[PDB]
Symmetry: C5
Subunit: 24 residues, 5 copies
Amino acid sequence: SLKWIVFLQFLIVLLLLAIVFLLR
Amino acid sequence: DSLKWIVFLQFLIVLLLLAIVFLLR
Amino acid sequence: DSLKWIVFLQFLIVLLLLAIVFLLR
Amino acid sequence: DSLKWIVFLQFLIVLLLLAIVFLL
Amino acid sequence: DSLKWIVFLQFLIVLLLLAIVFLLR
């Protein structure tokens, strides 16, 4: 489960990067 | 247990973040 | 317990993202 | 000490999301 | 060290949320 927790954290960071890019 | 709920909630968060990206785009 | 608090705060994060989605529409 | 910091950072994330909700 | 990755990613999330707050107003 920890592997998937870390992987989904990766995904969340990438999506937040997309959101910050769109706001800019 | 707790970790399964963490994974499920993180998946829900991913879906919601995708929805926010779609709304912004 | 740390894990229970993490799960509950994850649930709150899900609620907050839902509220953000509602506000964006 | 990792779990303590994870809980604290989750709390910070909740606070920041609340700030964003108020701003919106 | 999965926990160290989790902490680092959480800190990244905090920084991105601070940037979002700055961009909002």
